[PDB]
UniProtKB/Swiss-Prot annotation:
Residues 1-62 bind DNA. The lineage of its organism: Eukaryota, Metazoa, Chordata, Craniata, Vertebrata. Component of the multiprotein chromatin-remodeling complexes SWI/SNF: SWI/SNF-A (BAF), SWI/SNF-B (PBAF) and related complexes. The canonical complex contains a catalytic subunit (either SMARCA4/BRG1/BAF190A or SMARCA2/BRM/BAF190B), and at least SMARCE1, ACTL6A/BAF53, SMARCC1/BAF155, SMARCC2/BAF170, and SMARCB1/SNF5/BAF47. Other subunits specific to each of the complexes may also be present permitting several possible combinations developmentally and tissue specific. Ubiquitinated by TRIP12, leading to its degradation by the proteasome. Ubiquitination is prevented upon interaction between TRIP12 and SMARCC1. There is a cross-link at K25 (Glycyl lysine isopeptide (Lys-Gly) (interchain with G-Cter in SUMO1)). It is linked to Meningioma: A common neoplasm of the central nervous system derived from arachnoidal cells. The majority of meningiomas are well differentiated vascular tumors which grow slowly and have a low potential to be invasive, although malignant subtypes occur. Most cases are sporadic. Familial occurrence of meningioma is rare. Coffin-Siris syndrome 5: A form of Coffin-Siris syndrome, a congenital multiple malformation syndrome with broad phenotypic and genetic variability. Cardinal features are intellectual disability, coarse facial features, hypertrichosis, and hypoplastic or absent fifth digit nails or phalanges. Additional features include malformations of the cardiac, gastrointestinal, genitourinary, and/or central nervous systems. Sucking/feeding difficulties, poor growth, ophthalmologic abnormalities, hearing impairment, and spinal anomalies are common findings. It comes from Homo sapiens. This is SWI/SNF-related matrix-associated actin-dependent regulator of chromatin subfamily E member 1. It is found in: Nucleus. The HMG domain is essential for CD4 silencing and CD8 activation; mutation of this domain blocks thymus development.
């Protein structure tokens, strides 16, 4: 099943957020990722929305 655009971004970027400060707890990583997504341009977000749209089409055809 396809992953939501916001959280596929969270998966792709989680490790580098931990790399910036390994002492960060899980809830601190999620709070930061929320800020990073907010900083994204609308065209950057559209790439993840396109990817999920392609992901949705494939899964529904199975």
């Amino acid at each position: 099943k396809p992953l939501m655009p916001y959280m596929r971004y969270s998966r792709k970027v989680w490790d580098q957020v931990k790399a910036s400060n390994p002492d960060l707890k899980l809830w601190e990583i999620g709070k930061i990722i929320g800020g990073m997504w907010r900083d994204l341009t609308d065209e950057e977000k559209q790439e993840y929305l396109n990817e999920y749209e392609a992901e949705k089409i494939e899964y529904n055809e199975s």
